[PDB]
């Protein structure tokens, strides 16, 4: 499989991938943006804190109508942030896959950082909703593809 980015150090890097994951694309894009050059161990602790409501995820685009918390005040002075648990758990699973792929290669888990993370839109799935005056409207999910490369340096 070809990712959108080459490792540039293919021997010293590990990758993980997920297609058509049933999690909101807009929520996962912000989660992926919050850990762009993060070290692997700090990324895991950050995502567990998000799961535990101790650290918020900053919502910069796709942010209209998002509350303000003060847990996100650093690196987002307006309080716009949230705690997307499903999008955090899905990324955590990918981080554990790439981590074990690195262990097979023998790269040390320490000094590993996310050199590439990407969320792309999957094909949408169809459901239905009913409206007043006998009308039917779409009721759609927005799944995503997630790509992840860990690198030593």
Partner RNA sequence: CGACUCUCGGCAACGGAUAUCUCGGCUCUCGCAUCGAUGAAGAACGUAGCGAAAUGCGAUACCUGGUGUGAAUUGCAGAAUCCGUGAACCAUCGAGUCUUUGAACGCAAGUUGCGCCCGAGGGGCCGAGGGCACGCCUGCCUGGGCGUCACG
Which residues contact Mg ion (rule: CB under 5 A)? Answer: 130, 134
Which SS3 state, helix, strand or coil, does residue 117 take?
strand
Q: Does 106 bind K ion (CB under 5 A)?
A: no
User: Biggest alpha carbon distance in the chain?
Assistant: 63
Residue placing its CB nearer to RNA in the complex, 29 or 44: 29
Which residues contact RNA (rule: CB under 7 A)? Answer: 2-5, 33, 60-61, 76, 118, 120-124, 145, 147
- Return the residue of 65, 77, 134, 138 that touches K ion, per CB under 5 A: 65
130 annotated ligand-binding residue? yes
Measured at the alpha carbon of residue 94, what is the angle toward residues 88 and 100, in degrees to the nearest 5? 135
Beta-bridge mates of residue 137: 129
Residue placing its CB nearer to RNA in the complex, 99 or 143: 143
Q: Does 77 bind K ion (CB under 5 A)?
A: no
Residue placing its CB nearer to Mg ion in the complex, 61 or 133: 133
Instruction: Produce one character per residue of 54-85: b if its CB has 16 or more CB atoms within 10 Å, e if not.
Output: ebbbbbeeeeeebeebebbeeebeeebbbbbe
Annotated binding site for Mg(2+): 130
């Amino acid at each position: 499989v070809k990712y959108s980015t080459d490792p540039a150090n293919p021997t010293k890097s590990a990758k993980a991938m997920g297609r058509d994951l049933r999690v909101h694309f807009k929520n996962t894009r912000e989660t992926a943006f919050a850990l762009r050059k993060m070290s692997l161990n700090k990324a895991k602790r950050y995502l567990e804190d998000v799961l535990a409501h101790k650290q918020a995820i900053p919502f910069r685009r796709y942010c209209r109508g998002v509350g303000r918390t003060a847990q996100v005040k650093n690196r987002q002075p307006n309080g716009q942030g949230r705690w997307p648990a499903k999008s955090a758990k899905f990324v955590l699973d990918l981080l554990k896959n790439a981590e074990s792929n690195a262990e097979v290669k023998g790269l040390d888990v320490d000094a590993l950082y996310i050199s590439h993370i990407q969320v792309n839109q999957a094909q949408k799935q169809r459901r239905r909703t009913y409206r007043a005056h006998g009308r039917i409207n779409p009721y759609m999910s927005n799944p995503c593809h997630i790509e992840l490369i860990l690198s030593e340096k």
